[PDB]
Amino acid sequence: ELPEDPRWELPRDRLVLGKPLGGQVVLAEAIGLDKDKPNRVTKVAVKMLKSDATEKDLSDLISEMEMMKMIGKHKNIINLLGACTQDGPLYVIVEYASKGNLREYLQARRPPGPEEQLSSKDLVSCAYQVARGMEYLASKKCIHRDLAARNVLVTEDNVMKIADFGLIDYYKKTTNGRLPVKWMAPEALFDRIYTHQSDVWSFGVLLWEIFTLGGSPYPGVPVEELFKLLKEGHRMDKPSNCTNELYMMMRDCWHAVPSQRPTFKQLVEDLDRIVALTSNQE
Ligand SMILES: O=C(Nc1n[nH]c2cc(-c3ccc(O)cc3)ccc12)c1ccccc1
């Protein structure tokens, strides 16, 4: 009993559902996703209601879909492709990223104790692509609030895509057993203040994740000890196989004063320059 938006509506019979990927997300094939391409099958990700889903859950899912419509398309975000709103449960159809989240992608490509190995240029490129996605989201007045390698997805073509931009208990942990408070700006953590500046702080932690090839920030540090580290002005160590220039970029993202952090616009220009100058030879 949902209103149709014909621009975005895909007939239910065009969506071949497949195995679970993670609400609730399944892999699917869409036939004729594109009006000018009715015989093309596209691998997509379909977000839907779980079996014991509340009225708020359906309200959250609709809100994420409507937010994605307003933000519009960018290469370095997970883009809305369609929806099934008529004659069944709500399906929100988004881009599929076959190579998983950036933490998984990096860990799988660590040098031996893997199939593929990343160059220094490839790591800086990852950072540039996330910065570009975030600059686009910022330009649309979207504050992420949980920017982390876990919320960046990687496509078959190694494109970085920001996820969960459309959507706390400080002690709740991720699937992977990590504490999301470890990505949060002090003003977000202590004062509940979330800005593009607090997302730049999170981007600092994400740069550290990239240069540690999916390293875990503050391993073994519980929430109460993290709070004390932040109050003391502690900053994470420079990763090995990270230039002084990229470490100083991380430190600048971690400025105690939100106004003094670089913007995503600044980070994109600086990372553009650094990519050009960074070796792909190791
Ligand atoms: O999740 C995967 N792929 C995904 N491709 N696109 C996605 C989009 C989402 C998604 C979309 C909207 C949301 O609100 C939250 C998550 C989740 C997973 C994916 C994946 C998992 C394991 C191995 C390989 C791929």
From Swiss-Prot:
Location relative to the cell: Cell membrane; Nucleus; Cytoplasm, Cytosol; Cytoplasmic vesicle
Cytoplasmic topology ranges: 1-282
Impact after mutating residue 145 to G: In HH2; with severe ear anomalies
Binding positions (ATP): 47, 95-97, 101, 150, 164
Active site: 146
Reported effect, residue 272 to V: Abolishes interaction with PLCG1
Domain of life (superkingdom): Eukaryota
Annotated positions of the Phosphotyrosine modification: 170-171, 247
Tissues with expression: Detected in astrocytoma, neuroblastoma and adrenal cortex cell lines. Some isoforms are detected in foreskin fibroblast cell lines, however isoform 17, isoform 18 and isoform 19 are not detected in these cells.
UniProt effect for mutating residue 141 to N: In HH2; some patients also carry GNRHR mutations; impairs tyrosine kinase activity
PTM note: Autophosphorylated. Binding of FGF family members together with heparan sulfate proteoglycan or heparin promotes receptor dimerization and autophosphorylation on tyrosine residues. Autophosphorylation occurs in trans between the two FGFR molecules present in the dimer and proceeds in a highly ordered manner. Initial autophosphorylation at Tyr-170 increases the kinase activity by a factor of 50 to 100.
Domain Protein kinase: 15-282
Disease / disorder: Pfeiffer syndrome: A syndrome characterized by the association of craniosynostosis, broad and deviated thumbs and big toes, and partial syndactyly of the fingers and toes. Three subtypes are known: mild autosomal dominant form (type 1); cloverleaf skull, elbow ankylosis, early death, sporadic (type 2); craniosynostosis, early demise, sporadic (type 3). Hypogonadotropic hypogonadism 2 with or without anosmia: A disorder characterized by absent or incomplete sexual maturation by the age of 18 years, in conjunction with low levels of circulating gonadotropins and testosterone and no other abnormalities of the hypothalamic-pituitary axis. In some cases, it is associated with non-reproductive phenotypes, such as anosmia, cleft palate, and sensorineural hearing loss. Anosmia or hyposmia is related to the absence or hypoplasia of the olfactory bulbs and tracts.
Biological role: Tyrosine-protein kinase that acts as a cell-surface receptor for fibroblast growth factors and plays an essential role in the regulation of embryonic development, cell proliferation, differentiation and migration. Required for normal mesoderm patterning and correct axial organization during embryonic development, normal skeletogenesis and normal development of the gonadotropin-releasing hormone (GnRH) neuronal system. Phosphorylates PLCG1, FRS2, GAB1 and SHB. Ligand binding leads to the activation of several signaling cascades.
Similarity comment: Belongs to the protein kinase superfamily. Tyr protein kinase family. Fibroblast growth factor receptor subfamily.
Quaternary assembly: Monomer. Homodimer after ligand binding. Interacts predominantly with FGF1 and FGF2, but can also interact with FGF3, FGF4, FGF5, FGF6, FGF8, FGF10, FGF19, FGF21, FGF22 and FGF23 (in vitro). Ligand specificity is determined by tissue-specific expression of isoforms, and differences in the third Ig-like domain are crucial for ligand specificity. Affinity for fibroblast growth factors (FGFs) is increased by heparan sulfate glycosaminoglycans that function as coreceptors. Likewise, KLB increases the affinity for FGF19, FGF21 and FGF23.
Domain comment (free text): The second and third Ig-like domains directly interact with fibroblast growth factors (FGF) and heparan sulfate proteoglycans. Isoforms lacking the first Ig-like domain have higher affinity for fibroblast growth factors (FGF) and heparan sulfate proteoglycans than isoforms with all three Ig-like domains.
Protein name: Fibroblast growth factor receptor 1
Residues of the full protein shown: 464 to 765 of 822
